[model samples]
Target: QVQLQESGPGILQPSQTLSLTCSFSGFSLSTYGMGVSWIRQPSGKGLEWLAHIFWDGDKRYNPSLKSRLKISKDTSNNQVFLKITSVDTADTATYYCVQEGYIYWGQGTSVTVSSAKTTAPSVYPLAPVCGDTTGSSVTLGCLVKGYFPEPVTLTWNSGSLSSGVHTFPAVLQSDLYTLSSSVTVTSSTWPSQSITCNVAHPASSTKVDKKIEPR
Candidate 1:
């Protein structure tokens, strides 16, 4: 059982420094040998790996932010600290504390560098449907819709299907986005197997998952 909580200021002035803390419970920094990372995403951008601090006090940072970013930890309190100096409006983003490989995450904290002008995208998943069934194989479609901030990542959990998973790029309708992907699987395995579609956008706190079993 592990839990992490992020705390920091909601707003900051231009050129001011940003400081954040990740307070964790249910695990000791010394006993838990894994490292923690500070990741952020701008309003409509992809995730950026800012820095990471290991339990042994070793630190690594992204080359882009290495000059102004500082990552540290306090083993006595089981907390990780992040500080970034000389911030600007482009630095506004949602910050998250992620365990190794993002297995566990804290609820992200929103930070506005200069002004509050960003909005998180809304995500919706569509149920998958089967099409063009043959004696040997069947086609499955996973559709997702109603998302702002154009680019989104789609991942499919092909239970027993082959490795040829094809994902289409997102299509824009006015100001929203839609995406659909299809895969072919053996008819013998379609009925008993379940497929899951995970849709994620940088502005979203959690990705949406939709699962369906072929009928």
Candidate 2:
């Protein structure tokens, strides 16, 4: 079985940045098609999807998490990194690095945000792909060649997903179109509802939205 562990300071003062790393074992980052996810959990709450680092160097973040989240990868170490800026105590939570497979989880690390810092809200891409709710598996892809080494996200709504869904983002640096984000969802009902894909970035004002429809 693949094991994941997170390491970072347990506490932080106000306006300070919180950084953490996730280490992995029993998995091959270079070979697996799965993406790595960074999630945060409040003292007493459910897991919050932060962002993901895909194999292609493409990144994506949860729209809800765009304001204070940063996720990056180190291919050489086979590890991933996360940073949150200007954390207030409300930002205090246990963070984790996880792989989306049959089950999703990490060893979990805790951080406390205490002060106000000058952090900017990130802007994501606005590329949406939709499909009819009639198929078993629906796929949406965001083409982000203009941005290199930056990450994007693919989101699905209106349908329930199977366990261990794989979101693989790929980048082809050899060509002009180098980076892309791809996510797959399998549903029992076809085109059950509208599906939306969004890309979040640290430089933009709002998240980019794309809607997908069933045929």
Candidate 3:
């Protein structure tokens, strides 16, 4: 029930301003509530701290963004907000909101300081070319690629047999982001019900489902 989600425009123009919000649940931003920190990783790089929003209504930012960032909280809205001006390619990354009070992280919102054009992803649901087995479980693989502005959610479905879903971290390949996920099901059920991969991306504003059935 506890969660944090960072939200903002997926695409941003360089040399402009970028605003973001982190709405949290199962927690509070009261005078003595848990504090939060912000960090972002370039698609192919390590993490960089953006700022820290203290419980006492104080914020400290990284030297790199200190002068250009504004971090604030709204206890009434149960949200934390941050903004940076003069954005550039260097600031393009997946900005994450981390809660220290309870130690939870948001899936993060992707920010690309480039053209406003957004690219929707295409789903790849193929038969397992190679299977990784353990006892009786097998991983049914799925792939998604050719997207812009990053951050895509992938889910698996096999009728009511959809509990063992795993999403991998996304990667930046040839200027686009791609990620894969898998469904864990018993080896005996390998040729069971119709399998589907649900692809959700901000670009399309609709959930795309790719379904494949086996005999």
Candidate with better TM-score, 1 vs 3: 3
Each prediction's number of clashing residue pairs: 0, 26, 0
TM-score of each: 0.53, 0.50, 0.56
Best-to-worst order by TM-score is 3, 1, 2
What candidate 3 gets wrong by more than 4 Å, as runs, is 31-33, 116-215
Best candidate (score: lDDT) = 3
Any idea how many clashes model 3 has?
Answer: 0
**Native-vs-model 3 lDDT?**
0.78
Off by over 4 Å in 1: 115-215
Question: Could you tell me which 10 consecutive residues in candidate 2 have the lowest summed lDDT?
Answer: 116-125
For candidate 2, give the lDDT: 0.61
> Which regions of candidate 2 deviate over 4 angstroms?
101-104, 115-215
Q: Write the per-residue lDDT of candidate 1 for residues 1-215, one digit (tens) a residue.
A: 67889899987777999999998876766655778898998877899899998867778999988999998888788789999999997787899988763878889898876433223444343433545456667666677665654457777772444465667776556445667877766766555677776666665554676775544
- Candidate 2 per-residue lDDT, tens place, 170-210, comes to 43333211344445556643346545555544433335555
What would the TM-score be for candidate 3 when compared with the true structure? Answer: 0.56
> Which candidate leads the pack in TM-score?
3
